């Protein structure tokens, strides 16, 4: 049993016709102090998987090292390490899920909520969630923390069920993700303007976008708001 110290907020994601999109901001909070402004919370594994992590940052760095070690281990005595016997999103997720549940079962959890986004060998989209309790679930849209409350409702308007996935293009999906990140910046007190976004497409592969910013913000209407009720000036 511990308490999380340096923490990362929401990770958000969704499926689209040819793949998956995932995003997370670059902040490492220390309670109410917005301590670290250059933290990468999306960690790619190979060219077909991106693991997005929220919660305790020290535990995130540990998980980051496990995934790095996993790639090394898979390459050992494996002539097809960059082909048929390469690491799949499903393999990476199941490994993490095993570790998370084992750690909760020893009453010493990795204090994280994790989303594994990727594309399988046969082109199928992979998107699944796991957290400190070892709880797992999959959905056309997935989000952690505040994202679950604010991002999911917006992303579910685009892809409400399985049949909406083939009808959703990469442009529409990315637009929805970027809008959700803006909404989280308006409303989450432990978020930052700077974020990273990753697209894993079955045709164009892994596209990793760094140093993105929330833009096109509405603040002008604030000038007309005066007092808290009766005040006119």
């Amino acid at each position: 049993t511990q308490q999380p110290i340096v923490t990362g907020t929401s990770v958000i994601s969704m499926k689209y016709d040819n793949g998956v999109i995932i995003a997370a901001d670059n902040l490492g909070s220390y309670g109410s102090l917005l301590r670290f402004n250059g933290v990468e919370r999306l960690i790619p594994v190979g060219d077909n998987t991106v693991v997005g992590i929220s919660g305790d940052i020290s535990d995130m760095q540990h998980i980051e090292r496990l995934l790095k070690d996993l790639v090394t281990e898979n390459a050992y005595d494996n002539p097809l390490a960059d082909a048929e016997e390469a690491l799949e999103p499903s393999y990476i997720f199941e490994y993490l899920a095993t570790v998370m549940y084992q750690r909760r079962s020893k009453m010493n959890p990795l204090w994280n909520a994790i989303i594994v986004a990727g594309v399988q060998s046969n082109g199928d989209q992979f998107l699944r969630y796991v957290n400190l309790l070892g709880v797992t679930y999959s959905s056309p849209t997935l989000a952690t923390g505040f994202g679950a409350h604010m991002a999911n409702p917006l992303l579910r308007k685009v892809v409400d069920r399985e049949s909406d996935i083939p009808k959703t293009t990469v442009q529409v999906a990315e637009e929805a993700i970027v809008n959700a990140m803006r909404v989280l910046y308006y409303r989450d007190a432990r978020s930052s303007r700077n974020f990273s976004l990753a697209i894993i497409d079955k045709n164009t592969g892994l596209t990793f976008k760094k140093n993105l910013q929330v833009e096109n913000m509405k603040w002008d209407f604030a000038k007309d708001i005066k007092g808290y009720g009766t005040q006119k000036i």
Binding site: D77, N78, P79, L80, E84, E85, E88, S90, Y91, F93, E94, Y95, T98, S121
Partner: protein, 231 residues
């Protein structure tokens, strides 16, 4: 001579006699054949009985839905090694949601056997194994020796009089590799291969044991009237 008392002792010419004696146990064992195409992989095994009242000793063991082996030598040692393979296949599935590669399965068997050849007190395994399987890189056939040496092959045979079947497969190499999408013809070639190792006795209904794995074919063992078709 003076250097065969235990596995921890090299001879003056750099030989390990206890390992070689364990290798000898395989030669005493009954013949078993392995061969594959690009789509399927087949095991054929000549089972041995104690006498006419006795049953015929089982030679083939299933390890997973996509992998299994045939044995020649000490059967209990095959049970130990096959059990280890069952566990490793299972660890791969539970932890990584991943079917264990046949090549990696061979590496694990090599390393397990090796530890028994370098330590005092223990002994080498007294059995040879032919592992077949179908994974993400197609059909595979492996030959395991208790020295630790594991080898990937198109076809092979181990046990008594196995040289005859091995020569046949060496001639037929170009033919049976091309038998794709036809399980019965691949088995026929395996039954014809093991027949080159027979003397006096012939293939009967309770004598023959066949196993197959392939693209859309789980590892299944055929015994009894199920192999009468191929006699």
């Amino acid at each position: 001579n003076n250097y065969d008392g235990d596995t921890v002792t090299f001879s003056p010419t750099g030989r390990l006699f206890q390992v070689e004696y364990a290798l000898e146990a395989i030669k005493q064992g009954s013949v078993t054949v392995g061969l594959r195409s690009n789509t399927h992989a087949v095991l054929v095994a000549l089972k041995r009985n104690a006498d006419e009242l006795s049953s015929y000793q089982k030679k083939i063991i299933k390890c997973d839905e996509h992998m299994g082996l045939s044995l020649a030598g000490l059967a209990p040692d095959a049970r130990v090694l096959s059990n280890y393979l069952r566990q490793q296949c299972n660890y791969s599935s539970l932890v990584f949601n991943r079917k264990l590669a046949v090549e990696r399965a061979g590496h694990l068997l090599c390393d397990k056997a090796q530890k028994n050849t370098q330590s005092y007190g223990g002994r080498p395994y007294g059995v040879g194994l032919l592992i077949i399987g179908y994974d993400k890189s197609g059909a595979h056939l492996l030959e395991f020796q208790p020295s630790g040496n594991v080898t990937e092959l198109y076809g092979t045979a181990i046990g008594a009089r196995s040289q005859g079947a091995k020569t046949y497969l060496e001639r037929t190499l170009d033919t049976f590799i091309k038998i794709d999408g036809n399980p019965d013809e691949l088995i026929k070639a395996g039954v014809e291969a093991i027949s080159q190792s027979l003397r006096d006795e012939s293939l009967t209904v309770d004598n023959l044991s066949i196993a197959i794995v392939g693209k859309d074919t789980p590892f299944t063992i055929y015994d009894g009237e199920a192999v009468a078709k191929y006699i």
